[PDB]
Ligand binder design. Structure first.
Ligand SMILES: CC(=O)N[C@@H](Cc1ccc2ccccc2c1)C(=O)O
Ligand SMILES: CC(=O)N[C@@H](Cc1ccc2ccccc2c1)C(=O)O
Ligand SMILES: [Mg+2]
Ligand SMILES: [Mg+2]
Lengths: 368, 367
């Protein structure tokens, strides 16, 4: 098929409750959507960049720019396009993975819609539904955290992940363990906020039986993580560092990681995410599905991905209402702690135009 | 000191001759300059991004953007500023090293100009001049390459580096060795164009006594390089992979590298570059100064950097007229194969306003 053009939307969606992370607080989610147009029909992609370069180097304005001036033109110029061929067509351009991933997603949704095939089917789903956990931010006070956690447990979420940062690590975990007991699946995530010198402090988490600690150190410090794993008992999970299947293989060979968070956007797409899944599986490394506050479009693709065989831990693909009062698609609703895998062609969901329009702040067409 | 504001310039300078690399051909250099203004006075920084993200992920429009909307504001908002404090003030922002490095350069030039101290002095120079090599692009034909190389040798350049790429590796090297002999300092640079599966082809370079092969594989594939080093005799040098002092330490511990190319911009600044120099030195790893076609401003800072003790191989800091008929500063002129280290305060050079203006395509003030 030949790409006719792509529409770039900016979109802005308020969060039910502000969400605090070691790199800041977020009240509203600003994001990029893409509508790829082909002779056959349309498909949708979502970019997981944030407003500024605080989680990784990519951010909304920068992704929009590289998409407009480099990535989309290079696809418009090709005689034939496949989702798979996206990667080699964009290979000359270094990095910009979240951007490439978004564009691949859109192309893929189009391709698959035209073959009446689901994201699940293409990726290799073996399950109709997936158990879901929830990620809980940093709070101002312990009792406030305990209320939020108890709330998410009552809704039937299967696992709790706490954001952490120097100043907020051992106490919150101790408190959650004293209140809710030792049988709750419990894990933490630093989003890079520690250094190796903080090892004794992270070792203080040893006694609380956490599943894992996620990205304690900076993105590039793979060897540091392997050192850290020799000094603590909590298993290391990597997120930011895992930018590709190769990077996963490398981190595993070096003993830097025992469990991997897959975020499709972070690795340059759903197809590379499948590869990460398979590489980890070949080494005995469990994976789970990460989340970047996606709309229902990305959430639908993530739920499909999380239904692959080696996703053996609950993911962060929480229900739509954990982030948004009003999703721009048919919302995802937790049911017995699980989310159901979409069945339609492509994503198996699409934006409801009235809701999308409420929430769109800009729109531009990139054609021939 | 309190940063008053920064001026961003986009400039455009034609190259004496087009320059071909494994990621493409370039006829004109578009670049970003920064003029940092303080109560004390001014300083200059240069960004080494290119027009598009072909060498790394950063490019001119993208750097300008992250500078304008993130990096410069975060410095303007600080009570007190030092070159050293730039790093922690900008640490919340991930990556954008070439951009940060350009900004740090400008702040540093200002700070040092105010203390009447040279870049050389601040960085730890031990030499007044530095031996200079030259980088030669991919050519359409072998005889055309041989003419260009013979030319640079007549001008007295001390070492030759050839750009390489699948299709253009063993033949160009063989030809240069047959024509100019075994005593010429000779090396190659792939700018990431091979994979580990190309090992037998790179092993084909074994017999030609190259000083090194630079960045045969992709930026992130450090372990791959260590594997490659076990299968070839040419020493591995890394460039694109060496984004920081830590990354240099990591690559060295893994045996992925025996010689390191320092590009200040690529590592986030002249200060981090000094750290890369010192880390490599502590591990017995020689370094040499890389080049991104800088103007005389960046060239002046680089020559100063290259005068540090562990720069023991000739760098790519070639003379101004290797790239530009007309530099925007007092030009650098090769003399007995060397370039002299600037002596004035800061960079020791500044743009000649009439020259800069002819070549400026845009200009904006951030205050
Ligand atoms: C899912 C999780 O806890 N965090 C993501 C980071 C992240 C990034 C952007 C977000 C935007 C809106 C809401 C949550 C967000 C979470 C991660 O695991 O690092
Ligand atoms: C110095 C060298 O041979 N190459 C640089 C890449 C490079 C990049 C951009 C350039 C722009 C104009 C002229 C030369 C350029 C060289 C390097 O080592 O990777
Ligand atoms: Mg995470
Ligand atoms: Mg190089």
């Amino acid at each position: 098929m030949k790409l006719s053009g792509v529409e770039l939307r900016r979109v802005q969606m308020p969060l039910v409750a502000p969400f605090r992370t070691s790199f800041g607080t977020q009240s509203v989610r600003e994001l990029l959507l893409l509508r790829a147009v082909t002779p056959a029909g349309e498909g949708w992609g979502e970019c997981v960049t944030m407003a500024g370069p605080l989680y990784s180097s990519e951010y909304n304005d920068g992704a929009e720019h590289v998409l407009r001036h480099y990535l989309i033109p290079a696809l418009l110029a090709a005689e034939d396009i496949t989702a798979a061929k996206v990667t080699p067509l964009l290979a000359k351009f270094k990095g910009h993975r979240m951007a490439k991933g978004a564009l691949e997603m859109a192309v893929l949704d189009a391709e698959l819609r035209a073959h009446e095939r689901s994201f699940a089917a293409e990726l290799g789903s073996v399950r109709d539904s997936v158990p879901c956990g929830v990620s809980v931010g940093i709070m101002d006070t312990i009792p406030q955290l305990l209320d939020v956690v108890g709330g998410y447990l009552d809704e039937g979420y299967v696992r709790i992940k706490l954001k952490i940062e120097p100043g907020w690590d051992v106490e919150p975990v101790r408190a959650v363990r004293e209140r809710f007991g030792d049988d709750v699946l419990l894990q933490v995530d630093a989003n890079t906020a520690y250094t190796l010198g903080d090892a004794p402090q992270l070792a203080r988490l040893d006694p609380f039986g956490l599943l894992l600690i996620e990205q304690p150190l900076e993105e590039e410090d793979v060897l540091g993580h392997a050192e850290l794993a020799r000094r603590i008992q909590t298993p290391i999970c990597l997120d930011e560092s895992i930018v590709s299947a190769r990077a996963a293989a490398d981190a595993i060979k070096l003993g830097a990681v025992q469990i991997v968070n897959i975020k499709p956007g972070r690795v340059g797409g759903y197809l590379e995410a499948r590869r990460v899944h398979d590489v980890c599986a070949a080494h005995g490394i469990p994976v789970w599905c990460g989340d970047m506050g996606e709309t229902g479009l990305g959430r639908a693709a993530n739920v499909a991905l999380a239904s692959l065989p080696n996703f053996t831990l609950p993911g962060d693909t929480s229900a739509s209402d954990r982030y948004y009062k009003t999703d721009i698609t048919e919302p995802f609703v937790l049911s017995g702690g699980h989310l159901p895998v979409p069945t339609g062609p492509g994503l198996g969901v699409a934006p409801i135009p009235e809701l999308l329009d409420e929430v769109t702040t800009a729109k531009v067409w990139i054609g021939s």
